[model samples]
Target: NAMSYINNIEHAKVLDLTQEVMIEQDQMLSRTLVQRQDLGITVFSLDKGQEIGRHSSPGDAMVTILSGLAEITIDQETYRVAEGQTIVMPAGIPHALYAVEAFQMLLVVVKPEA
Candidate 1:
């Protein structure tokens, strides 16, 4: 089982999720840490200059930067997001993500009618 693949365990466990992933040269990566019928939590790593081109989500999504920097465009407005910052992208609005520098982020998506 995937859970069994984890080596250490402790009650009331505290894990550093951000330190578990790293960005690679010229590449972008996304790992889904949690998935459910109505929600999803994903971790993303992007190398400088990499991007997820414009697209729209079926549900509302939130982006929380873990490290480095990012350029986010929502409904044609661009935002520079740095470590520890957060942004919300409403459902159905076109948005895109770009890495201004190698970065990692947590993406939480909620689908009410899924």
Candidate 2:
């Protein structure tokens, strides 16, 4: 697990976050950018009307839209989030996401107390 933390872009590495995932018609895609015991980062590309099934996490999470739009339902309340917007999903809350149109998003989840 030594490389897990130290083996990363520490100095001069460059990345295009938007190009990390490709979109496909009627399908959704996701890529894990980083995965650690304490925290994780994931990028998602969603096609129009694609939905992520309802779920809950023990860790607190944040969703940031990179392109297009989406509807996020947290604990039965819906919110419209567009590019450049972010929303928080508290730990243990039921939630789900749907793409209103083609979109890309970055999801950050931080575990509680490791």
Candidate 3:
């Protein structure tokens, strides 16, 4: 029963990623699929105009956009990421995200314990 707290998606089930998350006006919602000491797998849904203030991670953060587009600022650079695209931000780098439109994404963080 390890990791049983995961309740959104199930093993042997084909997940429709877009339906796994829903956008809320002026807010961002996140669902965790896996969480351990050094790794995390999550899905996020953001409404248009939503923004995440600058922050840094202890490990590399990877993003895979599921729908729409976003602007992610890392180390003073802003990059536009759209659906079907992937980006990896290295560890300890300050970054922030702005949703240009309603969007959903999958995030995977890999820490030193890997």
Candidate 4:
């Protein structure tokens, strides 16, 4: 049994879910890595230059760039993020993220009003 609830983000294993979908051009992929909860509710090892097209969820989200860079656009606001940077996105709003330079991130989603 593992006693640790969270581990290092740099060594986190990532799942590849980009088999049949294209997150940039074909409009079919939305790949992600749901990290262990103790990692501060993070989504780790995100793809480089992957595009999560327009979508909405019940939880508001905040993204932190761990390595490389990302171009995140939400509510018609474009935010360029570099390593050691972060951004907040409201729930139910249109948003997208594209990697500018082989990015890695930790996405933290907060429960929003129901």
Candidate 5:
């Protein structure tokens, strides 16, 4: 089962990442397109004040802001990011994300095949 089998998104169609996921009051939601050992692709929607606490990944994690604004912290430094902006959190580095306002993003992480 190492082969890709993406889900939660339609294949062969034009899909807008900003519109791919929805937000809810006081909640954060994630819709994963793939979650495997070597790769991960997910869509996340967060309401204002929501957040993902400090964490690290085994692989480099990339984030693309789909809509609204965000506060992203990598290696203890925080930066504001907005729609169309992309950032990569280095592998094993501590990072976190905060919703300065309601926002959505696409996160992709990859690692070398074992």
Candidate 6:
């Protein structure tokens, strides 16, 4: 039927990169779906209570919650971001993200790593 468009949607390759760090925490590891390095569309899938670590990146990043809830810490302030919400981390700013619930998000890392 015409409503089956979604089933026929063949997009760019979706790559699943396994993350082994969280297995010991009794929580599932992280996974990312990227449209290749050149496309610059980076999507991440995180399970409940998992984190992406604390660090600073040279590239500015935007964290948009595609589903569930998340705690986004930029510098010293922690912001609770809900579904359909977005947070921007400027270049050189240290930040971290944790899933309050199983969530999906996008991290747009700019080129030149900055």
TM-score for candidate 5: 0.91
lDDT of 1 by residue, 1-114 (tens): 335322222335776766666788988877776576778788889999999999988889999999999999999799999999999999999999999999999999988865
Model 4 segments more than 4 A misplaced:
1-40
Which model, 5 or 6, shows the larger lDDT? 5
Per-candidate total of colliding backbone pairs: 0, 0, 0, 0, 0, 0
Q: Can you give the TM-score per candidate against the true fold?
A: 0.83, 0.86, 0.90, 0.61, 0.91, 0.66
Candidate number that wins on TM-score, 1 or 3: 3
Best by TM-score: 5
Order of models, best TM-score first: 5, 3, 2, 1, 6, 4
Note the residue pairs that clash in candidate 1. Answer: none
For candidate 4, the lDDT comes to: 0.62
**How would you encode candidate 2's per-residue C-alpha lDDT over 1-114 as one tens digit per residue?**
344542223334677667767788998888876787878888899999999989998888999999999999999899999999999999899999999999999999988767
Q: Which candidate order results from sorting by lDDT in descending order?
A: 5, 3, 2, 1, 6, 4
- Output the TM-score of candidate 4: 0.61
Better of 3 and 4 by TM-score: 3
lDDT tens digits, residue span 29-65, model 3: 9989878888899999999999889999998999999
* lDDT values for all models: 0.85, 0.86, 0.90, 0.62, 0.90, 0.66
- Judged by TM-score relative to the true structure, which candidate is superior, 2 or 4? 2
Residue range 1-114, candidate 5, lDDT tens digits: 545488888777998767778888999888999888899999999999999999999999999998999999998699899999999989999999999999999999986674
* TM-score of candidate 6 relative to the true fold: 0.66
lDDT of 4 by residue, 17-111 (tens): 22222223322222343443322354444456567777775677888876777898887888999988889888789888887655666677766
Model 1 residue-pair collision total: 0
